[PDB]
Paper text:
The completed glycoconjugate is exported by the WzmWzt ABC transporter to the periplasm where the O antigen is transferred to the lipid-A core to form a mature LPS molecule that is shuttled to the outer leaflet of the OM5. Wzm forms the ABC transporter’s membrane-embedded permease domain and Wzt contains the classical cytosolic nucleotide-binding domain (NBD). The CBD is fused in tandem to the C-terminal end of the conserved NBD of Wzt. The CBD is essential for capped O antigen export in vivo as transporters lacking the domain or carrying CBDs with compromised cap binding activities fail to export their lipid-linked substrates.
Indeed, each CBD monomer binds the methylated monosaccharide with about 234 µM affinity and at a 1:1 molar ratio. No binding is observed to unmodified D-mannose, suggesting that the CBD specifically recognizes the sugar’s O3 substitution. To delineate how the CBD recognizes the cap, we crystallized the isolated A. aeolicus CBD in the presence of 3-O-Me-D-Man and solved the molecular structure at 1.6 Å resolution by molecular replacement. The monosaccharide binds to each CBD protomer on their flat β-sheet surfaces, formed by β-strands 3, 4, 6 and 7. Specific contacts are formed between the ring oxygen and the δ2 amide from Asn313, the C2 hydroxyl and the ε2-nitrogen from His350, as well as the C4 hydroxyl and the carbonyl backbone from Ile299. The C6 hydroxyl group, which is absent in Rha, only undergoes water-mediated interactions with the carbonyl of Met353. Compared to CBD’s apo conformation, these interactions position its loop connecting β-strands 6 and 7 (residues 352-356, hereafter referred to as ‘trap-loop’) towards the ligand-binding site, thereby trapping the O antigen cap. The 3-O-methyl moiety fits into a small hydrophobic pocket formed by Leu300, Thr346, Ala348 and Trp362. The indole ring from Trp362 stacks against the methyl cap through CH-π interactions. Altogether, our data demonstrate that A. aeolicus CBD specifically recognizes the methyl-cap on the non-reducing end sugar of the O antigen via interactions that would also be consistent with 3-O-methyl-Rha forming the cap.
Numbering used by the authors:
A (entry chain B), B (entry chain A): 252 to 395
Write the structure that this text describes.
């Protein structure tokens, strides 16, 4: 798998208030990845994958799907992902990867399964049931 | 269960373009409920619950959790919910309810299991994996 022509040196989870692995549902999650390219690299893809305790994919995406071109010159980089964490309360794992190609069939630079364990606790927005939260609006009107 | 002091007479699903039961992932879903109150009712709560093809709770919420007060005089009403359908492609069901109290322990007016079948097909935005879609931002930068 990993050939380490690029390496993920460290992964940090952050809220808008500071570094933490504990988030209320709906809070903004920043994923910071310290990356070092040992050589020049073209067509680099970075991917994240959030899974639950039973290995089920909760949400995964990479920069090929987001349409984001990444080119690395030999040296150091900070990669950042940002997303509202609209998930049910629970315990989750984060997997990260640097590869080539949409489904890493072309080349594998560095894959780290379950690099971070984090958890969602409580609700930042409305309380809700189910695996995820959809921002919802409501109105009603009397009709003659 | 239901005592039918208020009755959901019909439930319809909507996009911003018209009535439909087929949505690309990320499209805005409107849920219309035709409601009949046969008598005056106070402290009414309206709830929706999206489940997947295996009976799993995907997302549910009600107007008590949204802190949206509802009072019904004898007559006819149109209830509308609106939400981004940030879900994986697949087949889903909608369950609806009118009751009293946050968790319907107080009174049950009308509960309809799987009132509508709908499905998410394709991606209005980025393609993704997992049960749900979290709107994500990416950036990278060299660091000394
Ligand atoms: C670890 O991230 C993975 C990885 O980039 C790749 O397998 O594609 C997935 C999205 O399809 C993404 O979640
Ligand atoms: C059918 O909707 C339900 C119902 O209002 C109640 O059981 O509370 C749930 C949210 O907690 C909501 O999904």
């Amino acid at each position: 798998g990993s050939n380490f022509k690029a390496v993920i040196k460290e992964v940090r989870l952050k809220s808008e208030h500071g570094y933490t692995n504990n988030f209320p549902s709906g809070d903004t999650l920043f994923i910071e990845l310290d990356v070092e390219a040992k050589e020049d690299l073209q067509d680099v893809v970075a991917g994240i994958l959030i899974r639950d305790r039973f290995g089920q994919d909760i949400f995964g995406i990479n920069t090929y799907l987001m349409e984001k071109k990444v080119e690395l010159k030999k040296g150091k980089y900070l990669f950042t992902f940002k997303m509202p964490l609209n998930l049910a309360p629970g315990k989750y794992t984060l997997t990260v990867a640097l590869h080539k190609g949409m489904d890493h069939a072309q080349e594998c630079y560095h894959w780290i399964d379950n690099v971070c364990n984090f958890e969602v606790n409580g609700f930042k927005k409305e309380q809700f049931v189910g695996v995820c939260y959809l921002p919802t609006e409501f109105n009603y009107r009397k009709i003659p």
